[PDB]
Design a protein around this ligand. Structure first.
Ligand SMILES: N#C/C(=C/Nc1ccc(Nc2ccccc2)cc1)c1nn[nH]n1
Ligand SMILES: N#C/C(=C/Nc1ccc(Nc2ccccc2)cc1)c1nn[nH]n1
Length: 263
């Protein structure tokens, strides 16, 4: 609804940054609303959903098993690895690693899983092969969050990301088992999900993955709807802001309030 585009432009004014925004009907894929749909923004940890989509595609093809145990060492740990740093001794299964990557944004889990699929080049190839010709992963955690201005490494476009997430959650790319697991991991997000669930009306469904990078970069991808069922995908990215979190969070509050008011 254009009143939500007003809030998006309000956010650009107040944040001093570019905001990219899409609402997509989950059933048809129709763009309901867009702002900078085909500009590039760093994905940050929102890529971890696409990563686990590629992992589940391999599980579906018998190329991977969710219960396969992965071992690793102290020198593999990168910044912000709250789950993996506790299983050097135990190791973790593929399923636990996707859970940690998606619900806790665990960076080492993401890097372990990237290795399993062939690295950033193969994630990019997976995306291209499902019709996303622009989303690209180039680097590993934590460098892929660098967000250098004008750098196209590790970026998506809001519209491509929205279309890609709809395909993963509801298209024929993944089996029913896999598409349900992917959305279940997103529904269990511990980072942004509890805040969004609190803010939405009672009983709403939300499944999401957020990300944060350098240089003010932030983003969220989400499937949400009333009455316990998702019916829309919403993608928001921003980069370039020097605002703190107070001002940033007031801005998303305003966009989200409008999205719901005009649903
Ligand atoms: N201020 C401002 C900006 C607004 N852009 C924008 C882009 C698309 C729309 N689209 C729109 C569609 C229906 C009703 C009303 C509006 C509305 C606003 C802007 N700044 N830089 N690029 N766009
Ligand atoms: N504070 C505050 C408010 C923010 N609430 C709100 C409402 C809906 C959302 N939901 C949301 C979902 C996806 C992307 C972005 C946001 C997020 C926040 C508010 N003011 N009036 N109504 N809600």
């Amino acid at each position: 609804h254009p009143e939500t585009l007003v809030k998006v432009k309000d956010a650009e004014d107040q944040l001093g940054a570019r905001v990219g925004y899409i609402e997509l009907d989950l059933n048809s894929g129709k763009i309901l609303e867009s702002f900078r749909p085909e500009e590039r923004f760093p994905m940050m940890s929102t890529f971890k959903v696409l990563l686990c989509g590629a992992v589940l595609s391999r599980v579906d093809a018998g190329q991977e098993q969710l219960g396969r145990r992965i071992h690793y060492s102290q020198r593999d740990l990168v910044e912000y690895s709250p789950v993996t740093e506790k299983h050097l001794t135990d190791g973790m299964t593929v399923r636990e690693l996707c859970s940690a990557a998606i619900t806790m944004s665990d960076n080492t889990a993401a890097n372990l899983l990237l290795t399993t699929i062939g690295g950033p080049k193969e994630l990019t190839a997976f995306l291209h092969n499902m019709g996303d010709h622009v989303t690209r992963l180039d680097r590993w955690e934590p460098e892929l969050n660098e967000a250098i201005p004008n750098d196209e490494r590790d970026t998506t476009m809001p519209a491509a990301m929205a279309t890609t997430l709809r395909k993963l959650l509801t298209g024929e790319l993944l089996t029913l088992a896999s598409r349900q697991q992917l959305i279940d991991w997103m529904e269990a997000d511990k980072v942004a999900g509890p805040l969004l669930r609190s803010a939405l009306p009672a009983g709403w469904f939300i499944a999401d993955k957020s990300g944060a990078g350098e240089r003010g970069s932030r983003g969220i991808i989400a499937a949400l709807g009333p009455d316990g069922k998702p019916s829309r995908i919403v993608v928001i990215y921003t980069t370039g802001s020097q605002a703190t979190m107070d001002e940033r969070n007031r801005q998303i509050a305003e966009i989200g309030a409008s999205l719901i008011k005009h649903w």
